[PDB]
């Protein structure tokens, strides 16, 4: 018979399976869609997570209650030494991708 | 007289000062020369709501809080005012007569330096201190032996 | 080909006030039961055969366990793509005051007093991101450009920082600099001993 | 923003540090940490707890009578903003800090004669 | 002997502060507001027997007199003689002051 | 409430993308590409 | 010159505004309509400042002042104090006070000559009020209310008080102030006069719910407009007031 | 219009249904027993809870007998559970306390004893006008 009191299911099925990632480095699954009219630019970068700290922001958000006021916000620091470009990979389009 | 009727007489009663004196009012002279605002007037005064409508509407327009600041120099109106310096509050040290007090402090510093306020100053004492340190080490070794046994 | 063998800094790719995406693997938790893995309700006290469980994993056909039922297993160490993270500052490593602001005039760097806990010091260029990111300390982070043109005013806002905390995260730190700690504390015994 | 001070121990209290107790008579008590807050809730006396600035001032181990300590106060009458005044206030602030450090060292050596 | 020592530090078990008690001793108006926040019919002894120093109500005059001989009352007296810790003393500990012009 | 997949919401977002966020991101892209071109030719 | 207005569809104008004979303070909102009402009435005759007090928007009840001075409570920040000082000219003295009853707009009501205060304010607070505002200070209640600033609107011309104020109390308070006093209501029968309106010597702003008879009472007692006086209440407007408030 | 106010930032809710709070006005009631919270959502087994500035429905357990037979709207003005403001301050009061109002937010009593929170004062102008101290 039917469930007496309705409740949404625990957890999302979009993030299945809940297994370990196949690689330690994160994989860029999709890059931004290319526009040949734009100037050339790199789409990504790498860094190392160092930790978190606290800031005070002078907020400029018209319509908000904290408009023209100071807000305390948490931030994350990512150490970003410069990368070195060492290669070039070309990709063609096939009916298999 | 009923309670409702008495409340009505309380509402229509006008209390006045008993000496008949009137307080002096302070109405500026430009109020008489003011022209009344009319929405249908093509030459009406432009309002902040009109500027807001012309610049994105409510919730988008960002008002300038420093536009009506009356400073000694108008170039200073958009400065970043210092607040924190080396773990101290700048507003705590803001004082209009700061230079006189700083001059008094510097004169006091010169007087103290002349009087020798900051000045800074035996081999037998060093030898007896070293010998006492050796004796304390020997006592510690003896106590460690006793603890072991 | 022109970029071959050359170093590319972060500020030639990203900019302050830009909203980006962060890709990384999450914190590992090991084998975890259903209560913390899926957020299910605990059974009452002294329930037979355990209470950190789902009471009925199947009451209905098919004669199988379904893939939608919560089960114990690996939690964390998952690949996550998180979007819409605002860049508050791109600090330069050679700047000796890259944690200073226009209203806080203390010449200080981003590294907290005593260093970042279990990391060390940040001596290079750094990105300051509002909020939190999927990874942990020491972990590789992939910062990506947003896939679409943004739709919020938060992506259009420009950030004005008044202050950045540089006190110790190894405890209840109350001082932003060692000079500030010394000035509050005063002269110690070892100061006269030296 | 501004730097506050802990009611119990007197340490600097930066934003988002500690906790504030709002009492029903109208008084706020800012604490820099849970240690000070929990000692307050246990009703310990900061004047008797030896790690507090209150105890140190009561015992005479802090320099109190000094001309360099008169430059910092809660200013209840504001001053119209002046760029030259603010810059010279910063310079005076640095000079006052240096002079205060020297006089504090002299005070400590006079204690430890 | 403290009743229910486990939850003594909860906010719902909080007792009156020593500086508030000092202000009660100095000014009867502040004590009058504090007693106005109570209900006399629920008070021990109908609120007639009250020690300001301990901020405590007692069931009888003999009970109050007997309480005055105990060491908690004398501890409160010694604390009040030493003085209560206040915001002004907290200011003086760090050498801060208020400038009103 | 209108869903995130609603046609009117999509059209409003498209107008915002075309008229407001687009020029700002184009100017930022111009600056970043100029800097990275300077690195590439140096 | 009595104008009905609203701050974000609220009729409590005195909650969000402070009006003296030398400046106006308005709460910072999400739009400029409330500021524009005061700007249309005062075309740069006196300054208008968009203020925040302790991070809040209830500035009419958190602040008190007159044409000579301004008082703000102890929770006002240094930056709000600096903004107020930079917006107001040097003829006005601004002071932050350490009064325990920090709702200064509720505990203080004042014109350019006298002030009435909550009876439990500190003596140092009373002395600071008398110095900065340049007024004589009395401790008073209106119909057994200690929040005099929220239960009376006061000007140099006259005053409007709580409707349940007795005639004897009206006479005594009118002797003490030196201005004519009238008991009446605002915002369709509300007795929170100070929370409901702001007034100075030539302009009053009330809520949109203020009905026409009580608006005419306000204009008569504060002498707003040509030929406005408190005698019209008991001679010319008596029938209207009796019919409306019976 | 239901009594849940708009423009209220998220804060920790310290008072669930079944809490007895103090009565901070002079309406004659001495305590308020919370039976419902305005604006509470739907979740299995979750107790509806409120914080400072929230409207609740309450019954009087102690006070005048004329108030004991009715369910009154009330606004929470003080709570003891610590909560954070947008300026970063975590703060708490020494008690839980509210004031009886109508659905339009106007106060039943004429005075407020003790201070009220900034959230309650900013969301309810009548409480702001009747507040002696705002903290
Ligand atoms: Zn502390
Ligand atoms: Zn006793």
Residue numbers in the entry:
A (entry chain LB): 2 to 98
B (entry chain CH): 357 to 477, 482 to 509
C (entry chain LB): 197 to 390
D (entry chain CQ): 1 to 113
E (entry chain Cb): 2 to 102
F (entry chain CO): 2 to 43
G (entry chain CN): 1 to 246
H (entry chain LV): 5 to 139
Q: Can I see the authors' text?
A:
The rixosome defined in Schizosaccharomyces pombe and humans performs diverse roles in pre‐ribosomal RNA processing and gene silencing. The Rix1 complex of the rixosome utilizes Sda1 as landing platform on nucleoplasmic pre‐60S particles to wedge between the 5S rRNA tip and L1‐stalk, thereby facilitating the 180° rotation of the immature 5S RNP towards its mature conformation.
This could mean that there is no strict sequential order of these events, but that also branching and parallel maturation pathways are possible in principle.
